Design an enzyme around this catalytic site. Sequence first.
Site: not given
Length: 279
Positions: A69, A161, A224, A39
Amino acid sequence: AAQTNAPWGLARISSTSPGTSTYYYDESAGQGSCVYVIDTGIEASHPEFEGRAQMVKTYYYSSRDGNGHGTHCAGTVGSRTYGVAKKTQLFGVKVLDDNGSGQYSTIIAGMDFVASDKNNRNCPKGVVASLSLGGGYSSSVNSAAARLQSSGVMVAVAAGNNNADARNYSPASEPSVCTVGASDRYDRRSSFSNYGSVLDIFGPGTDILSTWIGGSTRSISGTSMATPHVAGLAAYLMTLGKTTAASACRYIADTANKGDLSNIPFGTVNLLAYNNYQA
Ligand SMILES: [Ca+2]
Ligand SMILES: [Ca+2]
Ligand SMILES: [Cl-]
Ligand SMILES: [K+]
Ligand SMILES: [K+]
């Protein structure tokens, strides 16, 4: 053990029904396991990590999470307050830049890096990777995820998403990893969550409170956020001896809350990650 007033997602993972706020889990808590968070990196100095997080790899001028994030995903895996596996070791692999972007060849290199790097880590109870990223279908990207899983790592990836069939996304469409959709606190499929026969499981994805950079916290939403619940669950179950990296995704599907989620499209699993813990 019991954590009162927990984030809803943590309470949901240890519950046969929505609407409760206590998280129940075996005190072993994923001790002796490892989870890689691939990430934007992890702010390892955050008090919530307690010395259990570190950066092992970056592809950019720094290993610092300048986005937040990767920190948030990591905090859901294993932070003391906001994590599923509160005693796991966390390894940060920065494939995404501070904009949350990353070239596919860098993402691939990170996944092969973890497959080797686990040989340099102490993880007697097993190894997990949490991949809270995606783009369009790429057989190279899927193949890299397939190698990581093959090497002995429980791979959990975000479905995406786009409110679309995850067959068209990578690494979401790789059959051999654990592809995670998102739900909300009322057991609805998250409105943005991808779906499709390639989904293995759903986790809490909407309004998920967790760590952030600058030693803070916030609630954000996405597949996520659901992925690290399932990654943290796999690490916790492996510490318990209940499953292994090759079998964890199946074991999670097998032991899921079943038929409980609303707005699941026909042909998509109706399965909600659940630890089956009896206090
Ligand atoms: Ca899959
Ligand atoms: Ca799968
Ligand atoms: Cl910077
Ligand atoms: K759609
Ligand atoms: K049921």
